[PDB]
Amino acid sequence: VIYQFPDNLWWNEASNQVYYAQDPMKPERLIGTPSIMQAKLLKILCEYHPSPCPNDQIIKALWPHGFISSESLTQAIKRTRDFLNDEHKTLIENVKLQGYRINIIQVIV
DNA sequence: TTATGTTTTTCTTATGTAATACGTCTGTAACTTGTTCTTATGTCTGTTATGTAGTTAATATAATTGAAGGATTTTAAGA
């Protein structure tokens, strides 16, 4: 499965890495590989697409057995957008009091 | 005796972890602003009450109205 994101971004499940490509399976302009928690967050946001993803769902999926201080929620989804280079805050959207969403262009299965 | 492979230790970095501080989005409120329906009222008009002006041909030809045990003093008009 290949998820397409704005600015011609791609996250791959046929592999385990993110890139800026115009060819789905071809590794063009590699970003790298997200961490375990980053990959889990990206998977959760892509699965809840096109619906908004609730905050409690994210915290109980990323940290099933962790006493999260309620502020790692924002540091994590700040550096996740930074690692995808979302300087304009357009790649991942926050709808207030409803949750988060990630802008997916197309899905390749 | 000495060169070298190894293993353990310590330093360096990386992902997460949290704390406090401050900006954004959004939810309510103050301030106006346009539109439509309603209402009290000022004004015009018709109808009836009323207020005014006029006329009437035996003859008839100088009030009235009390008013009633007042004393005392002052001052103008008559002679």
Coordinates of C-alpha atoms (C1' of nucleotides) in Angstrom, one line a residue:
Chain A
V1 CA 0.0 0.0 0.0
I2 CA 1.3 3.4 -1.0
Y3 CA -0.2 6.6 0.5
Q4 CA 0.2 9.8 -1.5
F5 CA 0.4 13.2 0.3
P6 CA 0.5 16.8 -0.9
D7 CA 3.7 18.2 -2.3
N8 CA 4.1 14.8 -4.0
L9 CA 4.9 12.9 -0.9
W10 CA 4.6 9.1 -0.5
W11 CA 4.5 6.8 2.5
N12 CA 5.0 3.1 1.7
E13 CA 3.9 -0.1 3.3
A14 CA 5.4 -2.2 0.5
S15 CA 8.5 -0.7 2.2
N16 CA 9.1 1.1 5.5
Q17 CA 10.1 4.6 4.4
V18 CA 8.9 8.0 3.3
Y19 CA 9.9 10.0 0.2
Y20 CA 9.0 12.8 -2.2
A21 CA 8.4 11.0 -5.5
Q22 CA 6.3 11.2 -8.7
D23 CA 6.8 7.4 -9.0
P24 CA 5.0 5.4 -6.3
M25 CA 7.5 2.5 -5.8
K26 CA 10.6 4.4 -6.9
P27 CA 12.7 5.9 -4.1
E28 CA 12.9 9.6 -5.2
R29 CA 14.2 12.3 -2.8
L30 CA 14.2 10.1 0.2
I31 CA 13.2 11.6 3.6
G32 CA 14.1 8.5 5.6
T33 CA 12.4 6.1 8.0
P34 CA 10.1 7.3 10.8
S35 CA 10.6 5.9 14.3
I36 CA 8.4 3.3 15.9
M37 CA 6.0 5.8 17.5
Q38 CA 6.1 8.0 14.4
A39 CA 5.3 5.1 12.1
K40 CA 2.4 4.1 14.5
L41 CA 1.1 7.6 14.4
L42 CA 1.2 7.8 10.6
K43 CA -0.5 4.4 10.4
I44 CA -3.3 5.5 12.7
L45 CA -3.8 8.8 10.9
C46 CA -3.9 7.0 7.5
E47 CA -6.3 4.4 8.8
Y48 CA -8.8 6.9 10.2
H49 CA -8.6 8.8 6.9
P50 CA -10.9 10.3 5.6
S51 CA -12.4 10.7 9.0
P52 CA -10.8 12.8 11.8
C53 CA -8.9 10.8 14.3
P54 CA -9.9 11.2 18.0
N55 CA -7.2 12.3 20.4
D56 CA -8.1 9.5 22.9
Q57 CA -7.8 6.9 20.1
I58 CA -4.3 8.2 19.3
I59 CA -3.2 8.2 22.9
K60 CA -4.5 4.7 23.6
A61 CA -3.1 3.3 20.4
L62 CA 0.4 4.9 20.7
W63 CA 0.6 4.5 24.5
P64 CA -1.6 1.6 25.6
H65 CA 0.1 1.4 29.0
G66 CA 1.6 4.8 29.5
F67 CA 0.6 7.7 31.8
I68 CA 0.9 10.3 29.1
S69 CA 1.4 13.9 30.5
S70 CA -1.1 15.2 27.9
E71 CA 1.6 17.3 26.3
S72 CA 3.5 14.6 24.5
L73 CA 0.5 14.5 22.2
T74 CA 1.6 17.8 20.8
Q75 CA 5.4 17.4 20.8
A76 CA 5.0 14.1 18.9
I77 CA 2.6 15.5 16.3
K78 CA 4.9 18.5 16.0
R79 CA 8.1 16.6 15.2
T80 CA 6.1 14.2 13.1
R81 CA 5.0 17.1 10.8
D82 CA 8.5 18.5 11.0
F83 CA 10.0 15.2 9.8
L84 CA 7.5 15.3 6.9
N85 CA 8.4 19.0 6.6
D86 CA 5.0 20.5 7.2
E87 CA 6.1 24.1 7.7
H88 CA 2.7 25.4 6.5
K89 CA 0.7 23.1 8.7
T90 CA -1.1 21.7 5.7
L91 CA 0.1 18.1 5.5
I92 CA -1.6 17.2 8.9
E93 CA -4.7 19.1 9.9
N94 CA -6.0 19.6 13.5
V95 CA -9.8 20.1 13.7
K96 CA -10.3 21.4 17.3
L97 CA -12.2 19.2 19.8
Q98 CA -12.7 16.6 17.1
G99 CA -9.1 15.4 16.4
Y100 CA -6.4 15.1 13.8
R101 CA -6.4 14.1 10.2
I102 CA -3.7 13.6 7.5
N103 CA -4.2 14.7 3.9
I104 CA -4.0 11.6 1.8
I105 CA -4.2 12.0 -2.0
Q106 CA -4.5 8.4 -3.1
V107 CA -4.1 4.9 -1.9
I108 CA -2.3 2.2 -3.9
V109 CA -3.1 -1.5 -3.0
Chain B
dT1 C1' 59.8 -9.0 24.7
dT2 C1' 56.4 -6.8 21.9
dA3 C1' 52.5 -6.5 18.4
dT4 C1' 47.7 -7.4 18.1
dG5 C1' 42.9 -9.0 18.8
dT6 C1' 39.5 -8.4 22.2
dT7 C1' 36.5 -6.8 25.8
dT8 C1' 34.9 -3.5 28.9
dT9 C1' 34.2 1.2 30.0
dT10 C1' 33.1 6.0 29.2
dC11 C1' 31.8 9.6 26.1
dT12 C1' 28.5 11.1 22.5
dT13 C1' 24.2 11.3 20.4
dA14 C1' 19.1 10.2 19.7
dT15 C1' 14.3 9.4 20.8
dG16 C1' 11.3 10.1 24.1
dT17 C1' 9.7 13.0 28.3
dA18 C1' 8.1 16.6 30.7
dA19 C1' 7.3 21.9 32.2
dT20 C1' 6.0 26.3 31.5
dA21 C1' 4.7 30.0 28.3
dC22 C1' 2.4 31.9 24.7
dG23 C1' -0.4 32.1 20.1
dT24 C1' -4.8 30.4 17.2
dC25 C1' -9.4 28.9 16.6
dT26 C1' -13.5 29.3 17.9
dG27 C1' -17.8 30.6 20.7
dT28 C1' -20.4 34.2 22.7
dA29 C1' -21.6 39.1 23.1
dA30 C1' -21.9 44.4 22.0
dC31 C1' -23.1 47.2 18.3
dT32 C1' -25.6 48.4 14.5
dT33 C1' -28.8 48.0 10.2
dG34 C1' -32.3 46.5 6.9
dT35 C1' -37.1 44.8 6.2
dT36 C1' -42.0 44.1 7.2
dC37 C1' -46.2 44.3 9.9
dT38 C1' -48.9 47.0 13.1
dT39 C1' -51.0 51.2 15.3
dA40 C1' -52.2 55.8 16.9
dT41 C1' -53.4 59.9 14.7
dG42 C1' -54.2 63.9 11.7
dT43 C1' -57.1 65.1 8.1
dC44 C1' -60.8 65.1 4.6
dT45 C1' -65.8 64.6 3.9
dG46 C1' -70.9 63.8 4.4
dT47 C1' -75.1 64.6 7.4
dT48 C1' -77.8 66.5 11.1
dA49 C1' -78.6 69.6 15.0
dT50 C1' -78.6 74.3 16.2
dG51 C1' -78.3 79.1 16.4
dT52 C1' -79.6 83.5 14.1
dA53 C1' -82.4 86.8 11.5
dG54 C1' -86.9 88.1 10.0
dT55 C1' -92.1 88.8 10.2
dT56 C1' -97.1 89.1 12.2
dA57 C1' -102.1 94.8 10.6
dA58 C1' -110.0 95.3 15.8
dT59 C1' -107.7 98.6 19.3
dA60 C1' -104.4 99.3 22.5
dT61 C1' -101.2 105.7 24.1
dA62 C1' -97.2 109.2 31.3
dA63 C1' -94.0 102.9 37.0
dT64 C1' -92.9 101.0 41.7
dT65 C1' -91.5 99.9 45.8
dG66 C1' -90.8 99.3 49.8
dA67 C1' -89.8 102.3 54.0
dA68 C1' -90.5 102.4 58.7
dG69 C1' -88.5 102.4 67.9
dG70 C1' -81.1 105.7 65.2
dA71 C1' -78.1 108.6 68.0
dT72 C1' -74.3 111.6 67.5
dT73 C1' -71.2 114.5 65.2
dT74 C1' -69.4 117.2 61.1
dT75 C1' -69.8 120.1 57.3
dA76 C1' -71.6 122.2 53.0
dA77 C1' -76.0 124.8 51.0
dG78 C1' -80.4 127.7 51.5
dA79 C1' -81.9 132.1 53.9

